[PDB]
Amino acid sequence: DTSIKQGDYRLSSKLYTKLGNQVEAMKCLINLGAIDEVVNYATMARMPQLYILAGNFLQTTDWHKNPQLMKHIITFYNKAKAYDNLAGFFDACSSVEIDEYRDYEKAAAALNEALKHAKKSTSESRDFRIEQLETKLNLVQKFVQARALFSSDPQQMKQICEDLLAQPGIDQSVRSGDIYAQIIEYYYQVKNFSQAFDYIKKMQQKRIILAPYLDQEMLQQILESQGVSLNSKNKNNDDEFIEEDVPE
Amino acid sequence: INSDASRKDLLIQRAEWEVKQGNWKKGGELYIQAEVYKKAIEVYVTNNFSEGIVEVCRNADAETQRKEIEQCAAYFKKAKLHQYTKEAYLKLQDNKALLQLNIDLEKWDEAMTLAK
Amino acid sequence: MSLFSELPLDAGTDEQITQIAVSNVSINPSLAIITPHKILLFNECGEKHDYELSRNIRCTYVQWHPSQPIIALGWETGAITLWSEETKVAKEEPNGHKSEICLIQFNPSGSRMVSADIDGNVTVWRGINIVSQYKKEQSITHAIFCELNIDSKLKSGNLFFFGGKSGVVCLADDANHCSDVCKVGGSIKSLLFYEKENSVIIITSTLLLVMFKISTSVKTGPSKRVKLSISGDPQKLQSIWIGSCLLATCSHENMLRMWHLDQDDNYVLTLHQLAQQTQTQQGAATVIQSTNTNDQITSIQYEKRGKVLVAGTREGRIIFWKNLSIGSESPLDVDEWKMLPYVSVRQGVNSIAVGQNNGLIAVQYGNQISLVQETVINGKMTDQVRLLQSSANTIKIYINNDISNQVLHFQSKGNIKGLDCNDQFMLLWTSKTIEIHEIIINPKESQTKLVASIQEKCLRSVIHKENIILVNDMELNVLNFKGIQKQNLKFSESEGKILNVNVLNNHLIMWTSNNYIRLFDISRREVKQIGVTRRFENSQGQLGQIRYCAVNSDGSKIVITADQRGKSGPQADNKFYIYDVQTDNFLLYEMPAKCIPLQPYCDRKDRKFFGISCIINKNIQQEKNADENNDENEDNKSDKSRNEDDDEKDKSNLEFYTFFVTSENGIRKQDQYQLESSIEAVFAIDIPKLYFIKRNKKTNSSGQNYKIVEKYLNDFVGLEKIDNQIKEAIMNFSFYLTMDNLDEAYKSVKQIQNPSIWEKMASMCVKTKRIDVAEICLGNMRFARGSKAIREQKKEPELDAQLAMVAIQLNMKDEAVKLYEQSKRYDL
Amino acid sequence: IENQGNNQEARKLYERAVLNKDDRPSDRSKIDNHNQLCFAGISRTSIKLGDIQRGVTIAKELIDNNIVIEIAVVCENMKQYLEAAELYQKSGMLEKAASLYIESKDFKKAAPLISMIKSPNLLKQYAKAKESEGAYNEAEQTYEQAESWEDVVRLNLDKLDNLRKAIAVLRTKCDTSTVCLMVANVCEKQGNYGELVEFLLKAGKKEEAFQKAQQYNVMDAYSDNMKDFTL
Secondary structure (H helix, E strand, O other): HHHHHHHHHHHHHHHHHHOOOOHHHHHHHHHHOOOOOHHHHHHHOHHHHHHHHHHHHHHHOOOOOOHHHHHHEEEHHHHHHHHHHHHHHHHHHHHHHHHHOOHHHHHHHHHHHHHHHHHHHOOOHHHHHHHHHHHHHHHHOOOOOOHHOOOOHHHHHHHHHHHHHOOOOOHHOHHHHHHHHHHHHHHHHOOHHHHHHHHHHHHHHEEEEEEEEHOHHHHHHHHHOOOOHHHHHHHHHHHHHHHHOOOO | OOHHHHHHHHHHHHHHHHHHHHOHHHHHHHHOOOHHHHHHHHHHHHHHHOOOHHHHHOOOOOOOOOOHHHHHHHHHOOOOHHHHHHHHHHHHOOHHHHHHHHHOOOOOOHHHHHHH | OOOEEEEOOOOOOOOOOEEEEEOOHHHHEEEOOOEOEEEEEEEOOEEEEEOOOOOOOOOOOOOEEOOOOEEEEEOOOOOOOEOOOEEEEEEOOOOOOOOEEEEEEOOOOOOOEEEEEEOOOEEEOOOEEEEEEEEOOEEEEEEEEEEOOOOOOOOOOOOOEEEEEOEEEEEEEOOOOOEEEOOOOOOOOEEEOOOOOOOEEEEEOEEEEEEEEEEEOOEEEOOEEEEOOOOOOOOOEEEEOOOOOOEEEOOOOOOOEEEEEOOOEEEEEOOHEEEEEEEOOOOOOOOOOOOOOOOEEEEEEOOOOOOOOEEOOOOEEEEEEEEOOOOOOOOOOOOOOOOOOOEEEEOOOEEEEEEEOOEEEEEOOOOOEEEEEEEOEEEEEEEEOOOOOOOOOEEEEEEEOOOEEEEEEEEEEOOOOOEEEOOOEEEEEOOOOOEEEEEEEEOOOEEEEEEEEEEOOOOOEEEEEEEEEEOOOOOOEEOOOOEEEEEEEEOHHHHHHHHEEEOOEEEOOOOEEEEEEEEEOOOOOOOEEEEOOOOOEEOOOEEEEEEEEEEEOOOOEEEEEOOOOOOOOOOOOOEEEEEEEEOOOOEEOOOOOOOEEEEEOOOOOOOOOEEEEEEEEEEHHHHHHHHHHHHOOOOOOOOOOEEEEEEEEOOEEEEEEEEEEEEEEEEEEEEEEEEEEEEEEEEEEEEEEEEEEEOOOOOOOOOEEEEEEEEOOOOOOOOOOOOOOOOHHHHHHHHHOOOOOOHHHHHHHHHHOOOOHHHHHHHHHHOOOHHHHHHHHHHOOOOHHHEEEHHOOOOOHHHHHHHHHHHOOOOOOOHHHHHHOOOOOOOO | OOOOOOOOHHHHHHHHHHHHHHHHOOOOHHHHHHHHHHHHHHHHHHHHHHHHEEEHHHHHHOOOHHHHHHHHHHHHHHHHHHHHHHHHHHHHOOOHHHHHHHHHOOOOHHHHHHHHOHHHHHHHHHHHHHHHHHHHHHHHHHHHHOOOOOOHHHHHHHHOHHHHHHHHHOOOOOHHHHHHHHHHHHHHHOOHHHHHHHHHHOOOOOOHHHHHHHHHOOOHHHHHHHHOOOE
């Protein structure tokens, strides 16, 4: 306890381990900020609570770029049977994938895994969690459908994209910026600059920045087709966003 | 909070795609906004730019960003920035950092006065 | 390490040559020669075939089957012909095409083929039967079969991509589904496929390298447009794929550009190395023109089987590069590449053609033609018999006579492909015939007489007792000296194609392309297959692709060094395998990543003792050192001055390791040996001696000589005095000490005892880091001085100081210095 | 005297030394070190001479771990396996003790060892010991859990005939053609042959499956799946 107060987490953790108080040792090692010894003592201790603690600690860290970290998280949640925790981990993985890689098929697979593990859970809110997952999954799958339809059908583009955009709270599952960007890109492919610029405007009034979802060269060609400077329009849009934030 | 967070996040994202094409100083100054300390310190480590670190620490809040100034002073000490370390420690007023600097500087009279 | 044999060939035709092609069938290569009127066929010897394929209809294109001797031909009228030379059958389609053939290309499998004409018609065929037809605008220059990473049901080998001067590229299959990727435009010089990212690499006349990513239903713009800094002719620019991801480009210029995709690093090979070769060769009465190393290279070609890159200058020179990078991944810099001695040409070379048959090269300059072949240094070891294939015809024979080793120089009629011996007769096999000779050993002189010669074709011949097993890719038969066929054995097609063999005592092993391992016994008068076929497959999954295999004396233990092929990733695998016939399992030994195993060597007599050759992977260690040194390391003073550069002249990246193998504990490391740059390769391993091949750089001839070097083991140096029964006790003690079986080692040592044996025992104890047994050995020495030193030095908590004391007592100075440095002790 | 091989003299020499050093109680450190050495000597010589009980006991009360490990090595080398195994267990290193327990007829105490440690080679050797004993279901499960499931399906063929469990096994073990024909064998003894059709479709061995199905009139499912591979 004195070492904990003074910050000597290693000595306190070793003393607790030799005393059999493994949860205090895990807390001290988490406070230390080192991963390998925590994972090792989780593996030898084989306590489900320590498995959950190690899984949460690895979830806090950068599990995305290290496959070993996510492998250990999955193993810990399987050994501890923390089905809700594993479902939440898979949901977070899918959300990160959607946010910063835009790989909706991998996100759909992760949502399917999360739904399966939630269906293996026994919590009181499990069904609620399940339905939430499936709703997101459904929306993702619909967008994935459109992602295939880039080979076959324009009318199905318009119908499915408008249906997905009209759904409230879609950004919680599929970002509407990506949908608008792909609509604009398809319209440029058809070279219908009028409807492309109309959808550009529609994407503008939703107060989301065009740059993350749309290529700059795409936008500048489309705006040159209309015959208006893009810099002035961007400045006006930024000023409008600030003036809309002012009363809020 | 929510509106400020949303706007700051969007502009930091735009900062990321702009620094991908390459803009380090002008972009870094444009996207300071409020509490971008992690991205700013990553930029400064990448560019080895310590003047922005000093600007942040002198503009940092005294009662909430204490550890940030401590680690900035540690970076100054490991980079042989003696005067920046002194001013950061004077803002810190922590005996731990001052004693660490005194022992690392290999002198013993200021060690007298700080130990006393 | 290798030599290049050149054979000029007479064209024998008044008409000027237009095209040349080389067969790729692993045995018996064939050369196709296309003139404006006549079509000629040449064999491996370079003589005109009695049968001729020349026809009144003009030949405009020719192509070789990737795995079959069947040739594909296209006329000026668009008709196609499929002709088998082995059976001499021609199958010609009248309605092949309505326009002259521009290019023919085969898929890797050999089933489906794509043919194109100038009018833009592209037909995909199955064998000789038309499958699908496409009408595309403008002539398509090239079309390569593509293998996109698609689901199994959607995966098919019919998919291919084609490019042309219209700059239109589309995905097409045999089912007439043409997905027009199209895009870009202009004259696309070359198109290449990349498997990992399913990417398309485009080189055009616009001096722009285009890096497309293509999906079945997703089309995207180029990932990166690379600008090329080339002073040569853009039209003449050609690029070839080297290794996993390397790209080698030459545009009729003195500079050779190499691009690595993993880190996208570019580096240039110059011809100043040709100046170095001229300097090293203009040391005698040799007529060589002035060093004009600014010449341009007409053509560049690469061969995977030999890992050899060949470039041809327009002044009449041919330059060779060897890929020293272990593994199938591409080299990262110039240092990995090695530069081989060049071969001069009378006139400027025009065309270079490559066939995967000993790396066969067809070189055309003007109207003259020549053949180039590679001869790797090979060495055979039997009792009192050493055979060295120094050149194509020169053979060095070494006879172990106790008074003095006897050296004989034998000159053959021509080139020899393979050598073998069985301590009684020697057997050579070349492209022409097979010969058996008997060597008569006398103190005055050793004479060799030709026993017989049989004219038969086979891949590998193994002599034993009085019969020879002849093995070809799919079969193996037995022959006698007269030449009768007692029996033959076949192999199934699904197992693949046999790659290579190894033989020791009365047990022979071979491995095929599909990682299948077969074991045979020749102790019986007729060879017999032992056990059953075993795939290199573990219950968890495939362990990798076989690279090198070896078998111990009794055949119970098999050493394997394989490559896991981590899908454009880690450089093969540095952990090797040992297989036991009894347990039918592949135990895996892990060895530090700083080294990569290269080729195993099994002891002739001992079942447990064996050795492994290792290549030190410099690049990864350098990267790790650079990464680690940049962390709180600033201005380190003293004891650091040029300790890493001048020592690399004689020290190469070749190392040797010794191991004991047992079914109980598996693998244990015994000793390590450092190989100098003079040593070229490991010849053989023996209990008292180790044999190596050493280059004679001091030789003033064009071809440097090669000698056999005999070295003593670390536990046998110094003991120069009658080795008859000592080796058994030494090996038993070494094995027991590696096992740490102290009582057995003591009871084995008791029966002999000898002061030289005692000091050797102390040396093993020092090297194995055991002190009490070392004290017992020194006590048995009855050396009072060392014992007094030990008793004085026993008052030290550090055992490293005591070990250094023992080492300096037995006169090991640098080991003592290393131990002192390791113990952080300087006062002692 | 243990180097010369004279085992009997070691007993009396060590006993005399032990009595002499026990007579003197002063400076107990060197006396205790000498006692440990002499106890190790009598233990090893008694094991070599067949005096198992006294040797194993005097190995038991002694505390120095590496000496006990060496004595266990000697006694397992000579003839005595199980006693070496308990000495290994009491010396702090137990993996070889578990290996010897599964080597010997002590599976009852080896079961907890299999329970905590997850050594796959130990599991394979334990399953081999079980199949040598004759327990088909226990070795079946042991092969299931480690990785060795290729013999699981053939043992199901021989006596178990557990088709649903085998199907579950292939769906958790990444079935290949070698087991895809094991399951052809398992479905041969059903009389319906449809599951055989789907299994051989998953196999890729789609030539003899074709003729077998058309000999049994199941073209519906097999043709439905096969209309995309060859024509």
